[PDB]
Amino acid sequence: IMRVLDSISVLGVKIMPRAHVVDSDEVGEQMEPTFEHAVMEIYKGIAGVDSLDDLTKWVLNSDLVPHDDRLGQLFQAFLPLAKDLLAPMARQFYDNSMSEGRLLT
Amino acid sequence: KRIPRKTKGKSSPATAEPGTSNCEHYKARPGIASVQKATESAELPMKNNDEGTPDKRGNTKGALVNEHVEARDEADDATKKQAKDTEKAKAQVTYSDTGINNANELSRSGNVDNEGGSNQKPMSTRIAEATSAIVSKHPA
């Protein structure tokens, strides 16, 4: 959808340029433990999974609708990673992006 | 040939074939993987009760604890395992703290031996002591 809205230019002005639209993971990729790589490492806190592929096998049903209790345990493990190690970095990032213009995130 | 062992023991024209065509078009109605994953949950045999049993040398294996206290803590451990298997903070189907008074139950433990006495000293040390009491040495 970003590539489709890139190629619109009505009256000489471009409608929504790529140069000031913010992708979802741009706040996640600037951190040094690089958030997706940080939440790949969630499996060590859980007692009996001790591998990422074993975790992705264990949470699911082999139908790809997941169980609720595995999501509850993993969400209790996941919420401190999203509340502590994401939110002040997000504050700094969205403040920096608000400082350098008027953008769309 | 040359089969491995689980445990050590002693040693330390034209073929058109219009019949079959296997592609697609039937889904498992209760679900193959789900029903067979339940089956391999149920397939495992019972874990052993090796408590209060002799080992190789003859000593009763297991921890030194009262028999009734070991039975009650064993029901506690089963309740906690049921809680971890139903993935609640408390097992709804509980084995302990029931309405039935069961203050006389005893599960086997390492406190009592086969003859009927305590295991404060193991049987190998007791036999070795009772035979090292009567020895004799050379004269000077």
- Distance CA(B127)–CA(B57), nearest Å, equals 11
Interface A–B counts its CB contacts (< 8 A) at: 11
Report yes or no: A61 at the B interface, CB cutoff 8 Å.
yes
The two three-digit tokens of residue A58, written as one number: 């264990």
Could A62 and B34 be called an inter-chain contact, meaning their C-beta atoms sit closer than 8 Å?
Answer: yes
Which long-range contacts link A34-38 to residues 24+ away (Cβ below 8 Å)?
A: A35/A81, A35/A85, A35/A86, A38/A81, A38/A85
Q: Whose structure tokens read 């000077």?
A: B140
* Phi and psi angles of residue B70, each rounded to the nearest 5 degrees, phi first: -70, -35
CA distances from A36 to A8, A21, A78 (A): 33, 21, 12
* Phi and psi angles of residue B10, each rounded to the nearest 5 degrees, phi first: -65, -40
Chain B residues inside the 8 Å CB shell of A72: 87
Among A62, A69, A73, whose Cβ lies nearest the Cβ of B33?
A62
The two three-digit tokens of residue A35, written as one number: 């958030």
- Count of other CB atoms within 10 angstroms of residue B110: 19
- Distance CA(B85)–CA(A62), nearest Å, equals 19
Closest CA to A93 of A80, A81, A79, A105: A105
Q: Whose structure tokens read 């400082």?
A: A99
CA distances from B117 to B61, B99, B109 (A): 14, 33, 12
Report yes or no: A65 at the B interface, CB cutoff 8 Å.
no
Q: Whose structure tokens read 């045999």?
A: B45
Among A61, A69, A72, whose Cβ lies nearest the Cβ of B34?
A61
The answer to whether the CB of B31 falls within 8 A of the CB of B80 is no
Closest CA to A98 of B66, B108, A90: A90
- For every residue of B43-102, DSSP letters joined together read ---PPP--TT-B-SSSPBPS----HHHHHHHHHHHHHHHHHHHHTSSS-SS-SSS-SS--
